[PDB]
Amino acid sequence: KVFGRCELAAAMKRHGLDNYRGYSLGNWVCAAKFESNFNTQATNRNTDGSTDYGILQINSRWWCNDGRTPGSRNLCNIPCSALLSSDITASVNCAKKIVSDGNGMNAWVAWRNRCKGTDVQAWIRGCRL
Ligand code: NA
Ligand code: NA
């Protein structure tokens, strides 16, 4: 599923991401935009053989099991394919674990390079939330 901007903001808000660990909703929508272009089915293979999955491009080296990433942890305890669902619940619950990990949203390279320090409130402007 490809989310609309406000549609995703509302789904994320409903799932408790708004100001989760201090990150306003705009941050999460901005990250999703540049990680996956709001597409829950997005996948990308990394040089190290790991793969990123779903709306927030969660990596198989640490967070989910895709059965093909040798010596990987499955810290969110879920098959990576669960992260590709039109229901973003698994992605959101796993993202909460990631962002609590100590590096905050810097764990998402696109957020750090393209959202951090920008006017992220613009990503939810106009939406009825
Ligand atoms: Na893994
Ligand atoms: Na933080």
PDB file of C-alpha atoms and ligand atoms in Angstrom:
ATOM      1  CA  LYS A   1       0.000   0.000   0.000  1.00  0.00           C
ATOM      2  CA  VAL A   2       1.158   3.521  -0.835  1.00  0.00           C
ATOM      3  CA  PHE A   3       0.000   5.888   1.906  1.00  0.00           C
ATOM      4  CA  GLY A   4      -1.101   9.453   1.444  1.00  0.00           C
ATOM      5  CA  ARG A   5       0.844  11.961   3.525  1.00  0.00           C
ATOM      6  CA  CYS A   6      -2.006  12.847   5.934  1.00  0.00           C
ATOM      7  CA  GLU A   7      -3.350   9.298   5.889  1.00  0.00           C
ATOM      8  CA  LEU A   8      -0.040   8.008   7.223  1.00  0.00           C
ATOM      9  CA  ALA A   9       0.284  10.818   9.769  1.00  0.00           C
ATOM     10  CA  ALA A  10      -3.117   9.798  11.155  1.00  0.00           C
ATOM     11  CA  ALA A  11      -2.189   6.095  11.256  1.00  0.00           C
ATOM     12  CA  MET A  12       1.096   6.884  12.989  1.00  0.00           C
ATOM     13  CA  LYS A  13      -0.648   9.167  15.449  1.00  0.00           C
ATOM     14  CA  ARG A  14      -3.195   6.472  16.272  1.00  0.00           C
ATOM     15  CA  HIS A  15      -0.314   4.084  16.943  1.00  0.00           C
ATOM     16  CA  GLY A  16       1.292   6.415  19.501  1.00  0.00           C
ATOM     17  CA  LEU A  17       4.238   7.703  17.444  1.00  0.00           C
ATOM     18  CA  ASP A  18       3.334  11.355  17.930  1.00  0.00           C
ATOM     19  CA  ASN A  19       6.043  12.691  20.266  1.00  0.00           C
ATOM     20  CA  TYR A  20       7.247   9.165  21.035  1.00  0.00           C
ATOM     21  CA  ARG A  21      10.633   9.596  22.808  1.00  0.00           C
ATOM     22  CA  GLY A  22      10.280  13.296  22.023  1.00  0.00           C
ATOM     23  CA  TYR A  23      10.018  12.988  18.229  1.00  0.00           C
ATOM     24  CA  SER A  24       7.086  14.967  16.860  1.00  0.00           C
ATOM     25  CA  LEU A  25       4.843  13.357  14.255  1.00  0.00           C
ATOM     26  CA  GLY A  26       6.406  15.383  11.452  1.00  0.00           C
ATOM     27  CA  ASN A  27       9.705  13.567  12.026  1.00  0.00           C
ATOM     28  CA  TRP A  28       8.160  10.141  11.497  1.00  0.00           C
ATOM     29  CA  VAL A  29       6.291  11.168   8.348  1.00  0.00           C
ATOM     30  CA  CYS A  30       9.412  12.826   6.941  1.00  0.00           C
ATOM     31  CA  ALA A  31      11.441   9.667   7.613  1.00  0.00           C
ATOM     32  CA  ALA A  32       8.821   7.446   5.980  1.00  0.00           C
ATOM     33  CA  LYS A  33       8.757   9.750   2.939  1.00  0.00           C
ATOM     34  CA  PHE A  34      12.458   9.503   2.263  1.00  0.00           C
ATOM     35  CA  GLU A  35      12.940   5.897   3.375  1.00  0.00           C
ATOM     36  CA  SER A  36      10.139   4.294   1.369  1.00  0.00           C
ATOM     37  CA  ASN A  37       8.170   7.046  -0.387  1.00  0.00           C
ATOM     38  CA  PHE A  38       5.234   5.972   1.824  1.00  0.00           C
ATOM     39  CA  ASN A  39       5.207   2.469   0.210  1.00  0.00           C
ATOM     40  CA  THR A  40       4.778  -0.367   2.701  1.00  0.00           C
ATOM     41  CA  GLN A  41       6.212  -2.849   0.160  1.00  0.00           C
ATOM     42  CA  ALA A  42       9.544  -1.092  -0.286  1.00  0.00           C
ATOM     43  CA  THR A  43      12.629  -3.309   0.065  1.00  0.00           C
ATOM     44  CA  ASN A  44      16.295  -2.467  -0.523  1.00  0.00           C
ATOM     45  CA  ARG A  45      19.353  -4.735  -0.307  1.00  0.00           C
ATOM     46  CA  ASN A  46      22.448  -3.441   1.481  1.00  0.00           C
ATOM     47  CA  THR A  47      26.089  -4.105   0.634  1.00  0.00           C
ATOM     48  CA  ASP A  48      26.525  -6.288   3.727  1.00  0.00           C
ATOM     49  CA  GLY A  49      23.847  -8.715   2.481  1.00  0.00           C
ATOM     50  CA  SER A  50      21.167  -7.427   4.840  1.00  0.00           C
ATOM     51  CA  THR A  51      17.863  -6.014   3.529  1.00  0.00           C
ATOM     52  CA  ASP A  52      15.670  -3.073   4.594  1.00  0.00           C
ATOM     53  CA  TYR A  53      11.915  -3.616   4.776  1.00  0.00           C
ATOM     54  CA  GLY A  54       8.770  -1.594   4.647  1.00  0.00           C
ATOM     55  CA  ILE A  55       7.606   1.913   5.323  1.00  0.00           C
ATOM     56  CA  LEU A  56      10.474   2.674   7.709  1.00  0.00           C
ATOM     57  CA  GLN A  57      13.063   0.453   5.994  1.00  0.00           C
ATOM     58  CA  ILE A  58      13.876  -1.621   9.054  1.00  0.00           C
ATOM     59  CA  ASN A  59      17.055  -3.646   8.644  1.00  0.00           C
ATOM     60  CA  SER A  60      17.350  -7.467   8.782  1.00  0.00           C
ATOM     61  CA  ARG A  61      20.832  -7.405  10.348  1.00  0.00           C
ATOM     62  CA  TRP A  62      19.342  -6.385  13.698  1.00  0.00           C
ATOM     63  CA  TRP A  63      15.597  -6.134  13.813  1.00  0.00           C
ATOM     64  CA  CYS A  64      13.793  -8.840  11.856  1.00  0.00           C
ATOM     65  CA  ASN A  65      14.392 -12.294  10.396  1.00  0.00           C
ATOM     66  CA  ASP A  66      14.348 -12.760   6.619  1.00  0.00           C
ATOM     67  CA  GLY A  67      16.081 -16.122   6.729  1.00  0.00           C
ATOM     68  CA  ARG A  68      18.956 -14.938   4.587  1.00  0.00           C
ATOM     69  CA  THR A  69      20.996 -12.592   6.768  1.00  0.00           C
ATOM     70  CA  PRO A  70      23.698 -14.771   8.384  1.00  0.00           C
ATOM     71  CA  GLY A  71      24.397 -14.068  12.039  1.00  0.00           C
ATOM     72  CA  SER A  72      21.648 -11.529  12.323  1.00  0.00           C
ATOM     73  CA  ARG A  73      19.607 -10.752  15.392  1.00  0.00           C
ATOM     74  CA  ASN A  74      15.844 -10.558  15.319  1.00  0.00           C
ATOM     75  CA  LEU A  75      15.380  -7.952  18.029  1.00  0.00           C
ATOM     76  CA  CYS A  76      11.791  -7.103  17.109  1.00  0.00           C
ATOM     77  CA  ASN A  77      10.942 -10.825  17.006  1.00  0.00           C
ATOM     78  CA  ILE A  78       9.136 -10.847  13.657  1.00  0.00           C
ATOM     79  CA  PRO A  79       9.579 -12.058  10.119  1.00  0.00           C
ATOM     80  CA  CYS A  80      10.732  -9.154   7.953  1.00  0.00           C
ATOM     81  CA  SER A  81       7.804  -9.811   5.631  1.00  0.00           C
ATOM     82  CA  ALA A  82       5.434  -8.720   8.398  1.00  0.00           C
ATOM     83  CA  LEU A  83       6.899  -5.239   7.941  1.00  0.00           C
ATOM     84  CA  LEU A  84       5.571  -5.049   4.375  1.00  0.00           C
ATOM     85  CA  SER A  85       1.915  -5.224   5.435  1.00  0.00           C
ATOM     86  CA  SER A  86      -0.638  -2.505   4.650  1.00  0.00           C
ATOM     87  CA  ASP A  87      -1.221  -2.607   8.418  1.00  0.00           C
ATOM     88  CA  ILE A  88       1.730  -0.603   9.789  1.00  0.00           C
ATOM     89  CA  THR A  89       1.351  -1.940  13.325  1.00  0.00           C
ATOM     90  CA  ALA A  90       4.382  -4.253  13.221  1.00  0.00           C
ATOM     91  CA  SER A  91       6.548  -1.575  11.621  1.00  0.00           C
ATOM     92  CA  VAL A  92       5.538   0.982  14.225  1.00  0.00           C
ATOM     93  CA  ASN A  93       6.063  -1.334  17.204  1.00  0.00           C
ATOM     94  CA  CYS A  94       9.490  -2.265  15.910  1.00  0.00           C
ATOM     95  CA  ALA A  95      10.375   1.385  15.204  1.00  0.00           C
ATOM     96  CA  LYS A  96       9.585   2.184  18.855  1.00  0.00           C
ATOM     97  CA  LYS A  97      12.190  -0.381  19.913  1.00  0.00           C
ATOM     98  CA  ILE A  98      14.717   1.017  17.450  1.00  0.00           C
ATOM     99  CA  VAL A  99      14.312   4.644  18.451  1.00  0.00           C
ATOM    100  CA  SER A 100      14.667   3.733  22.152  1.00  0.00           C
ATOM    101  CA  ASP A 101      18.008   2.079  21.378  1.00  0.00           C
ATOM    102  CA  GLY A 102      20.162   5.055  22.331  1.00  0.00           C
ATOM    103  CA  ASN A 103      20.809   6.797  19.003  1.00  0.00           C
ATOM    104  CA  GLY A 104      17.224   8.005  18.625  1.00  0.00           C
ATOM    105  CA  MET A 105      16.075   8.658  15.063  1.00  0.00           C
ATOM    106  CA  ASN A 106      19.683   8.930  13.875  1.00  0.00           C
ATOM    107  CA  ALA A 107      19.344   5.195  13.262  1.00  0.00           C
ATOM    108  CA  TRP A 108      17.504   6.200  10.081  1.00  0.00           C
ATOM    109  CA  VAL A 109      20.087   7.608   7.693  1.00  0.00           C
ATOM    110  CA  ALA A 110      17.459   9.374   5.577  1.00  0.00           C
ATOM    111  CA  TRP A 111      16.057  11.090   8.660  1.00  0.00           C
ATOM    112  CA  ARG A 112      19.481  12.250   9.738  1.00  0.00           C
ATOM    113  CA  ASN A 113      20.415  13.496   6.258  1.00  0.00           C
ATOM    114  CA  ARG A 114      17.078  14.845   5.065  1.00  0.00           C
ATOM    115  CA  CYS A 115      14.741  15.561   7.981  1.00  0.00           C
ATOM    116  CA  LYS A 116      16.878  16.399  11.001  1.00  0.00           C
ATOM    117  CA  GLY A 117      17.056  20.154  11.564  1.00  0.00           C
ATOM    118  CA  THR A 118      14.450  20.928   8.910  1.00  0.00           C
ATOM    119  CA  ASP A 119      10.949  22.260   9.381  1.00  0.00           C
ATOM    120  CA  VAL A 120       9.394  18.825   9.884  1.00  0.00           C
ATOM    121  CA  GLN A 121       6.031  20.232  10.966  1.00  0.00           C
ATOM    122  CA  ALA A 122       5.479  20.926   7.253  1.00  0.00           C
ATOM    123  CA  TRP A 123       4.949  17.187   6.744  1.00  0.00           C
ATOM    124  CA  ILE A 124       1.700  17.228   8.742  1.00  0.00           C
ATOM    125  CA  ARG A 125       0.465  20.694   7.750  1.00  0.00           C
ATOM    126  CA  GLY A 126      -3.077  20.635   6.392  1.00  0.00           C
ATOM    127  CA  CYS A 127      -3.897  17.220   7.837  1.00  0.00           C
ATOM    128  CA  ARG A 128      -6.860  16.675  10.086  1.00  0.00           C
ATOM    129  CA  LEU A 129      -5.381  14.909  13.077  1.00  0.00           C
TER     130      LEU A 129
HETATM  131 NA    NA B   1      17.859 -10.776  11.448  1.00  0.00          NA
HETATM  132 NA    NA B   2      16.746  11.199  21.277  1.00  0.00          NA
END
